[PDB]
Amino acid sequence: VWKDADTTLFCASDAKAHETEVHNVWATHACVPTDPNPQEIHLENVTENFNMWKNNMVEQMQEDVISLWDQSLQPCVKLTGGSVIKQACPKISFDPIPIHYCTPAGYVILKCNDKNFNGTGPCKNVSSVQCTHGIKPVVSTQLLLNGSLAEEEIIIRSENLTNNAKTIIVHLNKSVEINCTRPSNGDIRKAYCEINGTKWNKVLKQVTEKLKEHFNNKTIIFQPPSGGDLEITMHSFNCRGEFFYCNTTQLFNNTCINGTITLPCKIKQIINMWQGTGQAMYAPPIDGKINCVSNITGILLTRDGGANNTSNETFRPGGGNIKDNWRSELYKYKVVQIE
């Protein structure tokens, strides 16, 4: 017998104590080693309600990632709350590692195993575990990178699809690689991303067909973001410690719904901090080839308002609330207290 509850979680990882990489350093001192032989108990004839949009596990992961970044990525100038902080900003080794979230004694994590689970409501196939799977704390906008994939069909997630103000998470069932490079020996901040146009357009077509099932077969159209901060209008992510900002106009191309798609990118030093603490200037990029190859496993979308009297629904890449990144992985878990 159990009940929904919140508690202080701890983390586990396979971090190396001899690594200088920042995620490894953080996890070495903030996490315990993983369980080599984890146990999972599949519950019989149980019905449990989940709500990925109201899950304290997400807030806790957010706090960890903020703590990790604050200790690891030092901007040269911090501009928070009228106070100016000038400090050293050394170049670091940066590459996210999987982090597991675990319950203390008296508590357990319930895991929804329904294959078409959208993140909210009842789940028929539930199991109990002591820890989540390994989740990489990848901070990005527009595109979700290096995450887990949906096992069967593409999944559409939203707290309220009818409310256009609520972010939509698209969960892909097949990854598409994105190849981003700041080339070696000149604009040191000029970069680009390469994506297989055949693979991407095929996946995007499948996404449109899924959205149709949720929007009464209305016509599905993609458009570039209307405006706002660069972190929202562009695909932003961190590669090897460097902040990349990529133009995704070519990705969301209704005409294509075949060759290599090349997105123009820029490395930015002056960014709006995702932690919500104003603006910051980070150090200029390292020398040589800067390269990151990632799997696109999800998409964050915002739906246009004012389309009720038309047969079209318009979707634009967006997000920015990094908590949604954690929701895309934590959706199937909830903490309960054993009475």
Ligand SMILES: N[C@H]1Cc2ccccc2[C@@H]1NC(=O)C(=O)Nc1ccc(Cl)c(F)c1
């Ligand atoms: N004011 C913040 C907090 C918040 C809350 C809800 C909605 C939007 C936002 C804004 N988001 C951002 O500013 C932000 O995500 N920046 C950023 C920076 C670097 C990288 Cl790599 C990256 F992915 C992202």
Ligand SMILES: *[C@@H]1O[C@H](CO)[C@@H](O)[C@H](O)[C@H]1NC(C)=O
């Ligand atoms: C529930 O579990 C059974 C047995 O594995 C499986 O056949 C069925 O597809 C599951 N139901 C859902 C909704 O995934």
Ligand SMILES: *[C@@H]1O[C@H](CO)[C@@H](O)[C@H](O)[C@H]1NC(C)=O
């Ligand atoms: C990239 O995608 C492939 C195919 O799903 C997967 O095998 C691989 O683990 C992914 N790489 C990651 C997680 O960075």
Ligand SMILES: *[C@@H]1O[C@H](CO)[C@@H](O)[C@H](O)[C@H]1NC(C)=O
């Ligand atoms: C992905 O999901 C779609 C339905 O959303 C399905 O038609 C397609 O077969 C799936 N792709 C793979 C590789 O399983």
Ligand SMILES: *[C@@H]1O[C@H](CO)[C@@H](O)[C@H](O)[C@H]1NC(C)=O
């Ligand atoms: C998820 O499923 C529940 C019913 O199980 C439904 O109420 C809700 O609208 C669904 N959410 C989405 C985004 O389809």
Ligand SMILES: *[C@@H]1O[C@H](CO)[C@@H](O)[C@H](O)[C@H]1NC(C)=O
């Ligand atoms: C979903 O959003 C619509 C549009 O704002 C709103 O009318 C409705 O009350 C919302 N539904 C729920 C479950 O709150």
Ligand SMILES: *[C@@H]1O[C@H](CO)[C@@H](O)[C@H](O)[C@H]1NC(C)=O
């Ligand atoms: C990434 O793109 C570069 C060319 O820009 C290529 O040399 C490299 O092989 C690509 N990486 C992968 C994994 O395809």
Ligand SMILES: *[C@@H]1O[C@H](CO)[C@@H](O)[C@H](O)[C@H]1NC(C)=O
């Ligand atoms: C692009 O993707 C297709 C499958 O959609 C694949 O057959 C082809 O080899 C890819 N092109 C390149 C340049 O790798």
Ligand SMILES: *[C@@H]1O[C@H](CO)[C@@H](O)[C@H](O)[C@H]1NC(C)=O
């Ligand atoms: C979408 O169209 C198909 C016709 O192939 C129909 O079976 C289905 O009911 C429609 N879905 C909605 C929700 O409009």
Ligand SMILES: *[C@@H]1O[C@H](CO)[C@@H](O)[C@H](O)[C@H]1NC(C)=O
């Ligand atoms: C992306 O590129 C297109 C085509 O050059 C351009 O019109 C658009 O303004 C760019 N978007 C941003 C956010 O810079």
Ligand SMILES: *[C@@H]1O[C@H](CO)[C@@H](O)[C@H](O)[C@H]1NC(C)=O
């Ligand atoms: C979308 O695809 C068409 C194919 O002809 C192309 O002409 C157009 O430039 C594309 N839009 C972009 C690259 O933003």
Ligand SMILES: *[C@@H]1O[C@H](CO)[C@@H](O)[C@H](O)[C@H]1NC(C)=O
């Ligand atoms: C995604 O995972 C691959 C393989 O570990 C890594 O090389 C790449 O840098 C990752 N991408 C991001 C944005 O962290």
